[PDB]
Amino acid sequence: KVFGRCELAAAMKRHGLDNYRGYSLGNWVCAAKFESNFNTQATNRNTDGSTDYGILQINSRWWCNDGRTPGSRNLCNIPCSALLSSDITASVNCAKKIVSDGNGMNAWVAWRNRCKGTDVQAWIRGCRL
């Protein structure tokens, strides 16, 4: 599924991401924009052989199992395929664990490079929330 901006903002809020670990909703929408362009089916292979999955590009090195990432963990206890669903529940639940891991949203390199410090409220501007 390719979400619209406000559509995703609404789904993220419904799933309790808004201000989760102190990160306002626009941070989450901004991260999804640059990680996946709001596409739940996005997958991208990393140089190290791991793969990033879904709207928030969650990495198989640590968070989900894809059966082809040697030495990796599965800390969200889910198949990486669950992170590609039209329903964002699994991605949200796993993202909550990631953002609680110690480094906040810096875990998402695209968030650090493209969203951190910027006017992230623009991402939810105009949305019925």
Q: Which of residues 74-103 bind Cl ion (CB under 5 A)?
A: 74, 79, 87-88
Size of the site for Cl ion (CB under 5 A): 16
The rounded Cα 107 to chain-centroid distance in angstroms is 10
Measure the CA–CA gap between 123 and 86, rounded to whole angstroms.
21
Q: From the list Na ion, Cl ion, none, which binds 45 (C-beta under 5 to 8 Å, kind-based)?
A: none
* Residue 119 assigned ligand-binding role: no
In the complex, residue closest to Cl ion by CB: 26
Min CB(107)–Na ion separation in Å: 15
Q: Active-site residues: which are they?
A: 35, 52
The residue type at 25? L
What whole-number distance in Å separates Cα of residue 53 and Cα of residue 112?
Answer: 18
Report if residue 6 touches Cl ion, rule: CB under 5 A: no
Which whole-number Å values give the CA distances from 81 to 10, 84, 100, in the listed order?
23, 5, 22
Site string for Cl ion, 25-64 (x = CB under 5 A): -x--------------------------------------
- Which position among 54, 60, 88, 111 is part of the footprint of Na ion (CB under 5 A)? 60
Residue whose tokens read 């206890």 = 77
Q: In this structure, what DSSP letter does residue 39 have? A: B
State the minimum distance, in angstroms, from the CB of residue 117 to Na ion: 31
Strands (E), 10-61: 43-45, 51-53, 58-59
Q: Which of 91, 27, 99 is nearest to 53 (CA)?
A: 91
Q: Which does 59 bind (CB under 5 to 8 A by kind): Cl ion, Na ion, none?
A: none
Which segments are annotated as binding site?
101
